[PDB]
Symmetry: C3
């Protein structure tokens, strides 16, 4: 059984009129796997959210299914789903009644609604969060204690030089006694391997912000995820990289015409036909 | 006996030339009720201020009265009036002698001299201090412990909602479970009375700055006190309210002509004849 | 024996390419008196700097002298001169080898190289440091305990008035009871001597910044030291004062023509012929 945005109660007894409040509490995540026998309880319809008992009574007409829609549960005293800590965006009507909600943890175009604090997202690119490649490796090197890995974000320790970055073969020749180099910004640029005296280059791991490519919410809900400055080989529809990074959820049409939505650094995006395509401008 | 600005001694042994220094010490307030038998002592004339003994010897020619003028008392060793903590503005001559002083606690147009730090106030409006209506009441409401007061600044406590404001009947209908409302600025806007379930509106009490309406000190000393944003029913010659607040010390002439001194928000003030009048611009 | 910039070792084992690093460590000062038998050790050539043993082997061809040039000593393990704490400016080549160094504590035009962080100083005036006349005297005066000194920077204490300045005869007459005066900036301007009741004027001692007058390093190395706002009677080639202060290392040519290098406040400086001259603009 799929919960079509069913369990949304009033977190506090505060009156709000025509606002979009952001609440951090225990709510039922939208489109969650619900058994078909805090916790959510529904019986075909008297919905109950226990945490404090919330109740709601809605007339229904269906068989062997869960009703689709939205219903706010009211505090009573001070199908089963489980509650999780989520950040919800509640829409309060002019009478204080919650008419709609957005769970900003399920899929893209939902975090964009939280970032913009609106149920209608315009046509464009929006930077929602960032992305840092976490090092899934840890190597330590000491002279004559693990193997040397390269071309991957790894926490290294070269005879006391603790750092975080990706190692690669450098074309710089150090002096016979110098053990590590430094750039203009007073940061460790290259290190000398205590074994085999190999010179390795240190590069900071991929640091970029994620962006959602949306052709407005009035046309369709199909969005594309855009990563800035990172390669998709390190990123956890169609996967393809571009000049600005990797774009998930679009196509790689070889055509080229006028730019529609500038995603940044060359390539632009557009909506065509029921499919999002990318083209070089 | 009236002290015509008599007791003003040298607070410290510091030499100053052509300055207007502000001193916070124990001085005799100007135009104070002096007995006709720290303390001020005068005998018709050898004035003494004890606190440290200050002395002054001035030739006088009068009977059954106190001499009018100004005389600075000099430190001697390390009619009777009493000293109070006052903020005085002393005028030092080119030889270090105090020639005049202003007690900025007696009447309006004297605090203006301290605010401007000058013995000559120009023609215009000057904001000297502020004014906050202190709540002369404290009510506490709990469900089934004092009476409910409205239309007056009162400290309230609605089942744990401690605040300060004026309560009035609101036209907003809360939900059957919501107990208090909140505006866009994340402040308590309305509360629900735990008794009779009446909805009350919370409004911050009158916050405004006082202003002195003076037609310059070269013409006359008659000034008018202007309160901004407050009603004279809550404010502790002629009393009348205007669009910018309450104006004390003027008239309410129904005539209208060109503006002379803009007191703010419409109405202007002018000097006519030996009387200060107000007129809508 | 004179050390012609001989002892300069690698402070740390860090690789740098085409940079000018500033190091604070124990180095041999340039042009220092070296015996002709941390410490510097050279033998005609295998130079050794002990601190950690640094070594260097350079072919030489000379007799009864010390070789002139520059040679960087490399770390080996973990004529005699002594090491002192100095701030050196090291020039790293594209291979990490130190090719030249500047000791910014020997003479002027060397501190300018540190201030500009370059081995080539342009033609102009550069403010390197400041200059405050330290009081070489301390007098204390109490009423009926040292002699009264004037026209010299001295720490004074007049019956509890501790301060620092130069005392001189003031033409201001205090009141018979006032002991010290104060200016507009709320600072002690004048004091009354508890003995003989003499009025003295307090003036802050000479505060100014030093400046190096250099006609560029591409033409010659002869520079002139310029002090701003101080008189040479208090300052520790040809000494002469000007409108902007005292200028050491130049001439006082009475001629006057177009300005070449504005040293500030009137007088300008120029290079003529092998001699630095100053002239009123
Ligand atoms: C530390 O030990 C390693 C392991 O023997 C040394 O690596 C070898 O060095 C020799 C001498 O140059 C080479 O012939 C081998 O091919 C190296 N081994 C590998 C797997 O390449 C290393 O040189 C030693 N380092 C020091 C400083 O002694
Ligand atoms: C708390 O007690 C008060 C006092 O009885 C209640 O106020 C009365 O409520 C009844 C029921 O509606 C009215 O008929 C009366 O007119 C009310 N009294 C007055 C003076 O107006 C109040 O309703 C009670 N509240 C709760 C929540 O029980
Ligand atoms: C403190 O003592 C000194 C020393 O005697 C006094 O200085 C003398 O004062 C007399 C009286 O005016 C003069 O005739 C002398 O010429 C002063 N001495 C010198 C060396 O000039 C001083 O006046 C005394 N101060 C007080 C306040 O008593
Ligand atoms: C709020 O309540 C009033 C009460 O009559 C009703 O007329 C109005 O339609 C309600 N608002 C909404 C959005 O339902
Ligand atoms: C992105 O990084 C991966 C790392 O595996 C590399 O193989 C690829 O060539 C990189 N692409 C670009 C365009 O830098
Ligand atoms: C200050 O003293 C001098 C002394 O002769 C006198 O001439 C002058 O008038 C005095 N100043 C004032 C304002 O009285
Ligand atoms: C000012 O406040 C008093 C409160 O008693 C009220 O009666 C009056 O109507 C108010 N006047 C205006 C102009 O708001
Ligand atoms: C650095 O080393 C390379 C190695 O061949 C050499 O060609 C180059 O001249 C060196 N650089 C300097 C400044 O000597
Ligand atoms: C500079 O100070 C000395 C102090 O001994 C003084 O003699 C000289 O007249 C002063 N010169 C100028 C120009 O102020």
């Amino acid at each position: 059984t799929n919960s079509f945005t069913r369990g949304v109660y009033y977190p506090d007894k505060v009156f709000r009129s025509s606002v979009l409040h952001s609440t951090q509490d225990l709510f039922l995540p939208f489109f969650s796997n619900v058994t078909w026998f805090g916790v959510y309880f529904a019986s075909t319809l008297r919905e109950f959210v226990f945490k404090k008992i919330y109740s709601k009574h809605t007339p229904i007409n269906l068989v062997r299914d869960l009703p689709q829609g939205f219903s706010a549960l009211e505090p009573l005293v001070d199908y089963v789903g489980y509650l999780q800590p989520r950040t919800f965006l509640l829409k309060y009507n002019e009478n204080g009644t919650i008419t709609d909600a957005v769970d900003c943890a399920l899929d893209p175009l939902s975090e964009t609604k939280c970032t913009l604090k609106s149920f209608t997202v315009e046509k464009g690119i929006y930077q929602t969060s960032n992305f840092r490649v976490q090092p899934t490796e840890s190597i330590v090197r000491f002279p004559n204690s693990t193997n040397l890995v390269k071309n991957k974000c790894v926490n290294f320790n070269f005879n006391g030089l603790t750092g975080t970055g990706v190692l690669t073969e450098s074309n710089k020749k150090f002096l016979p006694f110098q053990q590590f180099g430094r750039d203009i910004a007073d940061t460790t640029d290259a290190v000398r391997d205590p074994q085999t005296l190999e010179i390795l280059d240190i590069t900071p791991c991929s640091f970029g912000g994620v962006s959602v490519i949306t052709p407005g919410t009035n046309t369709s809900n199909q969005v594309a995820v855009l990563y800035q400055g990172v390669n998709c080989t390190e990123v956890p529809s169609n996967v393809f990289q571009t000049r600005a990074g990797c774009l998930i959820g679009a196509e790689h049409v070889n055509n080229s015409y006028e730019c529609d939505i500038p995603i940044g650094a060359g390539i632009c995006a557009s909506y065509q036909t029921q499919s999002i395509i990318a083209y070089t401008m």
